[PDB]
Amino acid sequence: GAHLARRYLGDASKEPDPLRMPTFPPDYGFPERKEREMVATQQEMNDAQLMLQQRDYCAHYLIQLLKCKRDSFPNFLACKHEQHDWDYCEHLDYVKRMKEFERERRLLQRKKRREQREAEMARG
Amino acid sequence: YRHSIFAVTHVLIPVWIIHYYLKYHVTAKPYTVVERKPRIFPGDTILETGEVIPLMKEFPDQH
Amino acid sequence: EHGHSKMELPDYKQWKIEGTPLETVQEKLAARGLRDPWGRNEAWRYSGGFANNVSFVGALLKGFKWGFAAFVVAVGAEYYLESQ
Amino acid sequence: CMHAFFKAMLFMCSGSIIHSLNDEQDIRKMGGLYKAMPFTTTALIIGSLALTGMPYLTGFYSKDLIIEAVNMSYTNAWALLMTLIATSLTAAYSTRIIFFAFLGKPRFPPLVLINENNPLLINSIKRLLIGSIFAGFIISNNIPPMTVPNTTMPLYMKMTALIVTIMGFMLALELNNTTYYLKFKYPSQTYKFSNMLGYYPSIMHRLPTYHNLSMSQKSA
Amino acid sequence: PDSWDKDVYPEPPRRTPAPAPQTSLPNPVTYLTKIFDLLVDRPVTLAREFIEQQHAKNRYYYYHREFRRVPDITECEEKDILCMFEAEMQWRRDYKVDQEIVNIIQERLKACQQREGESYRQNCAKELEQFTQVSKAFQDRYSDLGAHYSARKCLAKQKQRMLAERKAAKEAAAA
Amino acid sequence: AFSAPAAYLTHQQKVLRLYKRALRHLESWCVHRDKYRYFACLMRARFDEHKNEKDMVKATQLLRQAEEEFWYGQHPQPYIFPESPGGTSYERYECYKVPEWCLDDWHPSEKAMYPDYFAKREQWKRLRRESWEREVKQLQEETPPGGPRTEALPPARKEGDLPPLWWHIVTRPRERPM
Amino acid sequence: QQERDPWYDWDHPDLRLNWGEPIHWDLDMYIRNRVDTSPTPVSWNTMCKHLFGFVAFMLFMFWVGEIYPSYQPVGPKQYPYNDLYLERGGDPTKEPEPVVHYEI
Amino acid sequence: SDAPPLTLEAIKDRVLYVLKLYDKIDPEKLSVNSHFMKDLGLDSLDQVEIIMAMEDEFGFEIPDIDAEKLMCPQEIVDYIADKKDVYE
Amino acid sequence: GGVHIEPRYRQFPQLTRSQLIQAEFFSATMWFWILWRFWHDSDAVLGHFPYPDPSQWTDEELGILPDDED
Amino acid sequence: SFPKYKPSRLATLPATLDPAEYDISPETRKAQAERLAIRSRLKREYLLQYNDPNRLGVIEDPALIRWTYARSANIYPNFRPTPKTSLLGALFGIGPLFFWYYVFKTDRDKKEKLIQEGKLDQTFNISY
Amino acid sequence: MNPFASLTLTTLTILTIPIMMSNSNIYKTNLYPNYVKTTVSYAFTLSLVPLLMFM
Amino acid sequence: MLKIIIPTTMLLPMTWMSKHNMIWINATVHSLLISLISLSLLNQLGENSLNFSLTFFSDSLSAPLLVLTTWLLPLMLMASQSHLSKETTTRKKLYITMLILLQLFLIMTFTATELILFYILFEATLVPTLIIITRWGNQTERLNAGLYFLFYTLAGSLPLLVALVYIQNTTGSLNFLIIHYWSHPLSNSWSNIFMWLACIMAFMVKMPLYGLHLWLPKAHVEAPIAGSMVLAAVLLKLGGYGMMRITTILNPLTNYMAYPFLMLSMWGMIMTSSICLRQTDLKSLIAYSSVSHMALVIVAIMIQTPWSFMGATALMIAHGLTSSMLFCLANTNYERVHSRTMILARGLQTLLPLMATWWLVASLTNLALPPSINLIGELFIITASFSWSNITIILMGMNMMITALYSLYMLITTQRGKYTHHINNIKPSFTRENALMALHILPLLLLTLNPKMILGPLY
Ligand SMILES: CCCCCCCCCCCCCCCCCC(=O)OC[C@H](COP(=O)([O-])OCC(O)COP(=O)([O-])OC[C@@H](COC(=O)CCCCCCCCCCCCCCCCC)OC(=O)CCCCCCCCCCCCCCCCC)OC(=O)CCCCCCCCCCCCCCCCC
Ligand SMILES: CCCCCCCCCCCCCCCCC[C@@H](O)O[C@H](CO[C@H](O)CCCCCCCCCCCCCCC)COP(=O)(O)OCC[N+](C)(C)C
Ligand SMILES: CCCCCCCC/C=C\CCCCCCCC(=O)O[C@H](COC(=O)CCCCCCC/C=C/CCCCCCCC)COP(=O)(O)OCCN
Ligand SMILES: CCCCCCCCCCCC(=O)SCCNC(=O)CCNC(=O)[C@H](O)C(C)(C)COP(=O)(O)O
Residues of E with CB below 8 A from A74's CB? Predict the structure, then answer.
């Protein structure tokens, strides 16, 4: 999708663009701003040599899954729990990305509403 | 018997020749055979120097 | 070793347009005062083991019954073994 | 890897039909082979099911992931639309093959030479049949991960491949069922375009070559 | 192996993990490699020991040739053909030596890329820098000489390069 | 193929050729046998409405719009028999065929195998050698003066004679030599 | 030579030629292995128009889809160590401007 | 291939069988030597339809020039035998 | 390598019971595999993680003030 | 009425759509008869030679000799310098040469200018 | 030492034996197709091992 | 170097004192032994050269050409054994004498430490080939052909002599070593431009250059088989060898004087290739293919880079062997059909299978299939030209495609299809022809194993 239709047949300035997002400071919404955590260190992540695109905040569960796969090799369906954990953590990453997109969208909405209200007040 | 003589004259002899050639001639020169460095995961023993890898940062486990 | 067995043709009197769509074709033709001169020649295509047809969905479900029965038996065994 | 298996088996089945029908390739003259020749029938049915990406088959492991990845990437919309339409047309032409080669009344010459009783053909087809049933599952469960998976999707975008496959199945079957009706009409322009391969073989094999060869004799 | 120098061709300490069976099922890989060992590695080793003892029965040596250094083209008179001949031969030998130096560096780079795996972009920076430096030196020395390259042409290229560098330094200092 | 062509095609011949082509393309369009039979009867009914027309002008004016209509609806991918000039196996076995005269270059060791066949071959050679000298005179005396008017050959008329120019026609590698 | 009569007994069946007949100046142009001028079910100009129209339409709409892309309602992927600065190229002695990611 | 070596008797039996299914022509009057135009009172279109039936029956197509002058079952059998090189 | 089967000429061809049983067995195997895989892994076909509704998220955790603070 | 078929150079008019074949006159029939007559004379001549048991060689075909001689060795004696031939020769022999010369000269001048100015990044370019 | 290289090269090398033997007597008998098919099956079974080691 | 020249000279009294029926056996045996002796020159050093004496020297560019020249003569004798059966003893001895003289002149040409000696022998090679073409030629055009093959060459080479003596009046020596060591730049002047043209056109006309190639189809078509072999394999490489030897003094003029020629070659290798698509003659097709390959060699030499020189040397050797083999196959067909027309004898693979295999291998080598040395030279020259300018690849690409086309065309027209019915004088191939094709094709596939032997002195 609906956001495609909203951006392309509605108002382009109403919705964010994915290339330049985010356009607003992180602390504009709330000043708490807790930081994200990383479990796997640089050296162990390099030693597992996962991938450059697989070196995200999801890496510890990926390393555990690879450990299971190497350890219980012939029983190729033994460690399903590790696969579930890795999938769930990827799901949490994706939902965080969706939340960021929604936050940017509504921040732009309020910015445009504030601009329109200020223009109305100036005209009055 | 035909399968035995086939597996002898077709698999065993070429594999003998190739193993001899690789082990005693090709590997005599540097960088001719290069192997991917094996993956190292935390908690691994490591045979060459006998040094263990420390475990990870005990991530909060739930679901 | 080849097939020299002196195969013999069936009787030409066997083939009849009755009970086949060629009969509907003949009736539609007679409605216009026409008649097919070659109707009986193709009757063998609707006569023997070719008489019974299969639908596309039926063709896809070629071995559904036995597979479903085996799946039911296996899942029952799995249920009776896991609950132990 | 998956396409290798099921496409090779499909070609084996087609060649078996061709050899059994005295080197006849046109499907207009091949009729009811579902019951006249059952092993080729079931092998081709399994291959067609695997080609259209039916679940827990060789096709499902690769093609389903292809569609899921193309739906959730920063790509062209036109490319996505063409991928979906191509999947539907894949299901449709598989339906065409099965319907016109196995379902109707026999249309081959009266002297019937149909036979599959040869150990070589049976064994060669059945090995690739076992492959096209199990290799995708085995191999996808054996290979270590190499890309980030698509964990969460909207329900409509998760089933899109199956939806377009079933729509292709149904529309193709409906269009093929009208051939039994007693009516005749001349073909349209779209049918002519589709049958003559977009007229690409004609134009680009008559205009370029000539314009080269003539010069090769005239100027050079 | 002692056949090649380890300093010329460095390799990492090649740490390797130990097997940690997590299930009770016996893997096919260890049985297959044991069978391959018993069936192949033993007869080949026996044949090689026989060959090596036969070689040790008859031993002889060959030597690497050492070449003296001779005056080069810079200290060569204009039409003194003999010293130009010595200088040209020496320059050609130096050219071959430089080519093999670049070959050694490239072999090091390729080995690093293959060995480091998915982390080659970070773990092979040293080899890339070494190859960049040696390639710059080789390109400065020998590039654009032509098919009919000679010591005089290389000297002229070096002379033009040092003239340009001197002019640039003089301009920058007096800026 | 076997028959000698004529100088021109009569209107009857062109009508019959159109009938065969139209029936074949209609069969190609209608896959199923009953539908083909129905529409073939309709086609033959449409064909023989004008069987008894007498004047040449309209008969020539017909069979023209029929050709145009057929070319419009000609089913651009018709069914072709596998051995037909457009089929999938038109010239499949042409490479396999070898002329008879190749056997004249065989080594005597090869000719040691198959002795009866080569004796029969020699008998055929003798027969051809006599019959050709007979046939040349037969054709020279039988042809009209100034040159033949058609590519049709006469048969044998006497007792010991054979049809002129029969060696090539009689001996063909085969339809499928291997 | 492709559209010569297939059935007739040519002295040269492959080339479809007879002994003694005149040979076209461009025989090697038309040998059934090369350009042929056989009639087609559809006229040449209609074929050209349809093919060119299809190709041009596809190129144009590919360009349009490039102008109007498709994506998902998600933010950019976040990578931990300064956008993986060290693992992508390196240059470890420059101390890049740190990038820190937003938890929500 | 596995194609049985069909003989002249097979050709004649098949040709007579296909002709006997033609309801326009009576089964009793027809013979191996019975002419189509005169001995059976058929039409030219009927002759070409019979030729088409033979073409479909035997799986190979007869060119029009040689098909148009094929008027009797015996010469149909002879043409098929000559085309397919039948010994006996 | 096979067995001798004669042509039929307008009758159904002779069939061996071996090919019939093999074909039915393999089709049954395919369907059993499909069913068994689905029962065991229902989630792969239909998904396992629900797709949250973006509009159902409350204003608190998305960082919007009531249009006046900023 | 149906859409008319328009023949082109590479898609010729079908035989059954020629209006000329329906224009039948005694002269046309005589033309076809004498065409078949000369074809039958040539066929008879070729077949007499073809079946002769005594011949053990290649039947020389005057048509092939004429075709090859016309294609190869009969061009210059019939060539006459005309404005059409002169213009086509000048174009097809000189235009491509100067076109490619301009293209390559421009490309190499651009490369040399960049090299002299030094902004080309020839790193790792060792072999040339 | 590390059968990986030996086996991977041995598969490609065994694939070329019938090509060398195509000058021999077996090429003139009817057992050649069976010979080549058996060679391919053996090569497949042999190459199955390095894949297992990779897994 | 005398250990090779003296036996070549002794080949003449050996031939003239032989029996009436033992000329071929003795000539072939002793020519093969001479080639075996010439194989010793292959070993080389990365340093200067093998300077045998003041008169002769050897290099990594001269050695492969000498080996090929010495190896060709037995092949030419084997080819000529057939059609010279009905000749008198004296005429056959004279033919063998002409071949021996041509080999000796080429041998002395390729060593030739001094440039005037190189010119003298390089022009002395012109007489025996002219006699061979105009005396033992089948057609009536041979005489005309000879005139062409003569005058073109002389027109190119007469100014060169002038330039040479002028150089000796200026530099003082024409020995190649002193010329190399005392080389000096050529100022951009009209006099130097004309000296460049005089030095270059003589070797341009023989390669041949596009636009100067009219003599080659005539000479190759009208010549006998041995003449065609020696013209295609060795005589075309004299121009390339001379060009490689002489551009050491033309710098830096060659940087911008090469522009007219390069295009003439870069476009020409297209045009001639297209010509091969529409040809009714086998020998003409092979001649035009030779023209295309030699034009690409001209491009390589004019680029003047080490990779250019290596590619050019490899391509020269490979093309020589391939062209000789193709001419031999065409001659084997001609001796049976007496036509030399592609379309008349068709479907020969059914009648002559082993010769069909030889045709396939010859076409594949001419098609530049990897890893044959034809492709090695092809790719090296293409890479060097791409370094020269990134647009050249386009033309090269086109050439490559067209090459394959006409090559397979020549394979499909003659060997494939249905045999011509009225030709029945096609006897099974003799052992001599099969041995000739084997001796043509085995050295190519043996040379692909050791390419450094044919990459020239810049390897
Ligand atoms: C986003 C919302 C999602 C939901 C979307 C809606 C859901 C579906 C809605 C359904 C829509 C249509 C689906 C039915 C397909 C049509 C079937 C049909 O009727 O065919 C018979 C009919 C004629 O049949 P006939 O002549 O009588 O033949 C006699 C026998 O029937 C001969 O029979 P036969 O035995 O020889 O063979 C039979 C064969 C014969 O049938 C054919 O002839 C095939 C040709 C038509 C079908 C091809 C459709 C694919 C479209 C791709 C086009 C790409 C753009 C190309 C543009 C080119 C521009 C020149 O038919 C088949 O076997 C199957 C055909 C297709 C059915 C199965 C697949 C359909 C599902 C996929 C389509 C939509 C779902 C997408 C899924 C993803 C969701 C988004 O075909 C047509 O008339 C074509 C109709 C549509 C053509 C549109 C293009 C016209 C453009 C004209 C020019 C315009 C101006 C351009 C200017 C450019 C300037 C630069
Ligand atoms: C026939 C098929 C091919 C055969 C072989 C063809 C190849 C040979 C063609 C000759 C190659 C080039 C000749 C001259 C090249 C020098 C560059 C010069 O011509 O260009 C300009 C020269 O300007 C004009 O070209 C002046 C010359 C004009 C007169 C020449 C005739 C032009 C066409 C002749 C072509 C005919 C070739 C065949 C003859 C039989 C440069 O301007 P400028 O800075 O001033 O001169 C620089 C040189 N300086 C410093 C020594 C003075
Ligand atoms: C296949 C046909 C090719 C035919 C050969 C074409 C090449 C023609 C080469 C030019 C001809 C003259 C060559 C001179 C030999 C070199 C000697 C030299 O360079 O000395 C020059 C002399 O140079 C000349 O004099 C040359 C003048 C040219 C006179 C002859 C004209 C011949 C035709 C010229 C145009 C054709 C060239 C291109 C033809 C392309 C091929 C068709 C300097 O003399 P100095 O006076 O001592 O020094 C000056 C300081 N005081
Ligand atoms: C999908 C393709 C569509 C096809 C469309 C074609 C539609 C065709 C409709 C045209 C109708 C006509 O024939 S147009 C009618 C043309 N005029 C005549 O036919 C008059 C004389 N007819 C003859 O002579 C015949 O041969 C005959 C006597 C029948 C045979 O005779 P026999 O047997 O005794 O030999």
Answer: 23, 25-28
Of G14, G19, G27, the CB nearest to L418: G14
Could you tell me the residue ranges of all domains in chain H? Answer: 8-84
Residue F173 buriedness (CB in 10 A; 0-12 / 13-18 / 19+): middle
Class (C level, CATH) for H8-84 = mainly alpha
Residues 6+ apart with CB under 8 A from F74: F25, G41
Q: Does L426 touch chain J (CB under 8 A)?
A: no
- Pairwise CB contact (< 8 Å): H85 & F174: yes
Q: Is the CB of L291 under 6 A from ligand 3?
A: no
Give CA–CA dist A57/A36, Å, rounded: 9
Phi/psi zone of residue G72: left (φ > 0), alpha (ψ -120 to 50 degrees), beta? beta
Q: What's the rounded Cα separation, in Å, for the pair L96 and L90? A: 10
Q: Which two three-digit tokens encode residue L223?
A: 């010549």
- What method did the depositors use to determine the structure? cryo-EM
- Our CA angle for E159, E162, E166, nearest 5°, is 135
Residues of J whose CB is below 8 A from D206: 10-11
- Tokens found for residue D75: 């790509």
Residue of F nearest to H45 (CA): F16
β-partners of residue L58 are L50
Burial of L438 (0-12, 13-18, 19+ CB in 10 A): exposed
- Residue A75 near chain E (CB below 8 Å): yes
Phi then psi for residue L125, to 5 deg, are -65, -15
Nearest-CA residue for ligand 1 atom 27 is D187
CA distance D176 to A88: 45
| Ligand showing the shortest atom-to-Cα distance for residue D80 | 1
CA of H44, closest atom in ligand 4: 33
* DSSP notation for K20-43: HHTTSGGGGSTTHHHHHHHHHHHH
Active site residue H43: yes
* Phi, psi for residue D73 in degrees, rounded to 5: -135, 155
CA-nearest of L457, D141, L36, A40 to B56 is A40
Q: How far is the CA of J100 from the centre of ligand 2 (A)?
A: 17
The answer to whether the CB of L217 falls within 8 A of the CB of L167 is: no
The DSSP code sequence of chain J is: --PPP---SSSPPPGGG-GGGG---HHHHHHHHHHHHHHHHHHHHHHHHHT-SS--S----HHHHHHHHHHHTSSGGG----HHHHHHHHHHHHHHHHHHHHHHHHHHHHHHHHHHHT-S--TT----
Tell me how far apart the alpha carbons of residues D130 and I47 are, in angstroms, rounded to a whole number: 27
CA neighbours within 13 Å on the CB side: how many for L96?
32
Q: Cα angle vertex G64, ends G60, G70, to 5°? A: 140
Q: How far apart are CA G61 and CA L25, in angstroms?
A: 76
Q: How far is L351 from L347, CA to CA, in rounded Å?
A: 8
Peptide bond before L208: cis, by omega within 30 degrees of 0?
yes
Structure-token pair, residue L24: 């071929």
**Catalytic residue, candidates H13, H26, H43, H66:** H43
- Is residue L278 within 8 A of residue D216, CB to CB? The reply is yes
Nearest chain H residue to F15 by CA: give it. Answer: H45
At D57, phi and psi to the nearest 5? -135, 170
> Three-class SS string for chain E?
CCCCCCCCCCCCCCCCCCCCCCCCCCCHHHHHHHHHHHHHHHHHHHHHHHHHHHHHHCCCCCCCCCCCCCCCHHHCCCCCHHHHHHHHHHHHHHHHHHHHHHHHHHHHHHHHHHHHHHHHHHHCHHHHHHHHHHHHHHHHHHCCCCCCCCHHHHHHHHHHHHHHHHHHHHHHHCC
Q: How far apart are CA E3 and CA D210, in angstroms?
A: 64
Q: First CA to last CA across chain C, in angstroms?
A: 61
Neighbouring CB atoms inside 10 A of E56's CB total 8
